[PDB]
């Protein structure tokens, strides 16, 4: 421990304490907006799936990861990547789509050749149905007529709690017509080709609206922890400095007096 070293770490933790403090505030505004924009978007998602739950849909014989770009949000990108790699080995042909750069980097090296499309700038600007539609367009423009898929995302619960959730997407138009669909009448083969396409854009948007609410909340959290872990570390080293300042003055003085009291 030295006066040069001590103050260097005090100079830099008073940085982190503040840098982290504003990153809590930045995320705190983005949470409060994402919490309001989720309130309707939930009802929207509720009404979107209210058909696949009321009438059972199976498949006789596509993985979508939803997170963001900006990290430091605790364990948002890492919780969905765990449940993606869980199904990457458990299954059958598996083709992956990752929304948010932090899926192209966290679970890439392992499944580098199993990529279909990648999406950036997620979590910078609050998501829209317009963003979900670009996700819907690119999926249907690719020559991958998928049998069945599942979308994995972070569902919001509260300021601190969230859970990684799967939702199966029966978006194969060949799978749209099952024995449970025989209950329904007055349908076209190519009117489901319209409905299935749109109900896909809904659930993508819903998962995206849940994610950016669950993401900014735990970044607000992680940074409120980190800024007040630095607040504690400042208050700890500062009085460690005083110890070492007073002791250096005292010790430099004994060193003189000892030399004066020998002549």
């Amino acid at each position: 421990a030295t006066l040069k070293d001590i103050t260097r770490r005090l100079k830099s933790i008073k940085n982190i304490q503040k840098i982290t403090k504003s990153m809590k505030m930045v995320a705190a505004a983005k949470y409060a907006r994402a919490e309001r924009e989720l309130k309707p978007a939930r009802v929207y998602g509720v009404g979107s799936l209210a058909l696949y739950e009321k009438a059972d849909i199976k498949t006789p014989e596509l993985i979508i990861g939803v997170s963001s770009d900006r990290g430091l949000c605790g364990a948002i990108h890492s919780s969905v990547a765990k449940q993606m790699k869980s199904e990457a080995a458990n299954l059958k042909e598996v083709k992956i789509i990752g929304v948010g750069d932090k899926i192209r980097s966290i679970l890439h090296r392992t499944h580098s050749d199993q990529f279909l499309v990648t999406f950036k700038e997620v979590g910078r600007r609050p998501p829209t149905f317009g963003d979900a539609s670009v996700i819907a367009l690119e999926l249907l423009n690719s020559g991958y007529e998928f049998d069945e898929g599942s979308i994995i995302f972070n569902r919001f619960r509260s300021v601190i709690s969230y859970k990684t959730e799967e939702k199966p997407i029966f978006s194969l138009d060949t799978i749209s017509s099952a024995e449970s669909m025989s209950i329904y009448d007055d349908i076209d083969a190519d009117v489901l080709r319209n409905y299935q396409e749109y109900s896909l854009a809904n659930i993508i948007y819903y998962s995206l609206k849940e994610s950016t609410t669950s993401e900014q909340s735990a970044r607000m959290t992680a940074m409120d922890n980190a800024s007040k872990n630095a607040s504690e570390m400042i208050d700890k080293l500062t009085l460690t400095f005083n110890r070492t300042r007073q002791a250096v003055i005292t010790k430099e003085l004994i060193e003189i007096i000892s030399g004066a009291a020998a002549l």
């Binding site: 030295t2 060193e255 000892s258 030399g259 020998a262 002549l263």
Partner: protein, 82 residues
């Protein structure tokens, strides 16, 4: 090849003697020539030419540091010699 295990303990011994000889202390209560103490010794370990015998004396002195501080006064004082 001579090993001094260790020279820091010799310093404590030298500090004892010098202070007991009523000779004033310097930095860290060690006498003012605490550098001269080891430098004198460690210079004698050397490599002689063929004209003087061809022989040699190697030195591996040992220093104990507290809490990993090599930048400390006595450690650097010996580093500055070897």
């Amino acid at each position: 090849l001579i090993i001094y295990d260790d020279l820091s303990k010799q310093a404590v011994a030298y500090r004892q003697m010098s202070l007991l000889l009523r000779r004033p202390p310097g930095r860290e209560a060690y006498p003012g020539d605490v550098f001269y103490l080891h430098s004198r010794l460690l210079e004698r370990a050397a490599k002689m030419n063929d004209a003087f015998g061809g022989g040699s004396l190697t030195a591996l002195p040992v220093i104990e540091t507290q809490a990993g501080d090599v930048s400390a006064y006595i450690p650097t004082n010996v580093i500055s010699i070897t």
